[PDB]
Every structure is written in C-alpha cells, then in structure tokens.
Write a protein that binds this ligand. Sequence first.
Ligand SMILES: Nc1nc2c(ncn2[C@@H]2O[C@H](COP(=O)(O)OP(=O)(O)O)[C@@H](O)[C@H]2O)c(=O)[nH]1
Lengths: 170, 19
Amino acid sequence: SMTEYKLVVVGADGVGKSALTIQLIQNHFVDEYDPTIEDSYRKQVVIDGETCLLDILDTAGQEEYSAMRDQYMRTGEGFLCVFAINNTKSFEDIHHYREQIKRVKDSEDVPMVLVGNKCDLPSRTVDTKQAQDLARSYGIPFIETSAKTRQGVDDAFYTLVREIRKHKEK
Amino acid sequence: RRRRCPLYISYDPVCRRRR
Ligand SMILES: Nc1nc2c(ncn2[C@@H]2O[C@H](COP(=O)(O)OP(=O)(O)O)[C@@H](O)[C@H]2O)c(=O)[nH]1
C-alpha cells in the first residue's frame, strides 16, 4: 500500500524553493518575475520499492499568517532547508530556520536535509566545504541541486524521505 | 520582525511578539 510523507521546503525568499518543488512534481523549470505564492503539491512515486505519496509544502509569504503552513509545521515529518550557492546571506539564514524548526518541533532530531540550490551558476559564493561543515554540525546530509538542470533534485527529496524512515517507522 | 522567526508560525511564541 501507499505510504504518505509530509515534507516542508523552507529557506530565504528567492533561493528556488518553488523551482525545486515544481521541478520535482511537474518536471519543468520556473523563472517568474512574480514572487511565489505558498502552496502545497502532491507526488506519487516509487522510492526504494515503496509507493510513496509526497505531500510537500512550498513555503512562501514568510511574514504572513498561513493556516495551511501552521498545519504542515504541526504534522510535517521532514524539512528541506534551502539556500542558494550564489547568495551568502541565504546560507547565513539557514541557522535561524533550523533553530525555528527545532523550537516548534521541540526536538533536536527532526529529519532534515541541507540543500544548496542553483549549482548550475558560475557565481558561487558558498564553498561546498562550508556547507558540509554546517550540515555535519547539525548531523544532517548536504546536497547540491539545480532546479534549472534537474541535477540533484530527486536526490534531495528522496534523501529526505530516507531520513524520515531512519528516524521513525513508516 | 525578529531574525529568529524567519517563517511566521502562529503557535511559535517567538513569532507572536513584535520588536
Ligand atoms: N540558475 C538557476 N536559477 C534558479 C534555480 N532555482 C531557481 N532559480 C531562479 O531563482 C529565482 C527564484 O526562484 P523561486 O523558486 O521563485 O524562489 P522562492 O522564493 O524560493 O520560491 C527565479 O528566477 C528562478 O528561476 C536554479 O537551480 N538555477
């Protein structure tokens, strides 16, 4: 039978959270002038022989009240914490996202993957070693992705599913 | 806005305060 995994994608505005989610779900690359409106998306996919239903919240509108977001924070099982490899501030923001997740879940062992997106770009300002060190300090995996080329996209979300399975019976 | 509430969550006590 199907197993449901509730996933939440968080990170600074403009890092490519909608692009990653839409790449995964709809298999095309978005490049929109307009800022993302928060929404959730479902994907059915076989991961390691298990038929999975991924219920994914692409967070956005980060200053505003969202009933749906509150519910995903309550029930969400794993988090993608996304920065952009050409934006040092988005990387510096990761700690605040991680600390918020830890506070709201009241736990240090929440399934999480650190994602460095936009890895297709020639304008890197965050070294892979800095990101690996941060992820090691949190005890979580680090993966680079490009929503533009699809590099690493499936890997990031499937790794998160595998992290959830490592933490709890599914 | 508090740097420690990067994503507004209504039941996070940090988010409900304003500086
Ligand atoms: N080159 C490149 N641009 C990307 C990538 N992911 C997102 N973008 C661009 O980054 C901008 C912001 O992405 P968006 O998904 O709207 O950001 P969000 O606020 O995190 O949802 C858009 O112009 C996207 O096309 C990527 O992997 N590579």
